[PDB]
Amino acid sequence: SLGIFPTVEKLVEEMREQLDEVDSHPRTSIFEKLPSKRDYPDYFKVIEKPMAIDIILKNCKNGTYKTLEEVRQALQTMFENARFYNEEGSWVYVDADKLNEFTDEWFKEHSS
């Protein structure tokens, strides 16, 4: 069984369609995979629970996340990690906040 994967895959596609107004980069870009431990080894010593979109999708396929509540918390952690690690107003920080506002609206509709 695919569990909640079909619904979360739809959410992820909607997130990927949120593009920056100036350069059109998808706001999901920097969140698709974890930072490279080779490039940013210290990220893994300051961020207690790393999270990325690939992990959320794999967790939905393998049954680790069976509820939208679990996905909500995984996204919350992902965005909190980005707001902690990156400078306020940087492209990564703004992408986190804009995506978080979008996902909050989506969860509201799926909890209505």
Partner: peptide, 17 residues
């Protein structure tokens, strides 16, 4: 805001140590 040209992260300076 536009992506950093190399695509890098934007760590707070203290976290670059």
């Amino acid at each position: 805001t536009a992506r950093k040209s190399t695509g890098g992260k934007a760590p707070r300076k203290q976290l670059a140590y």
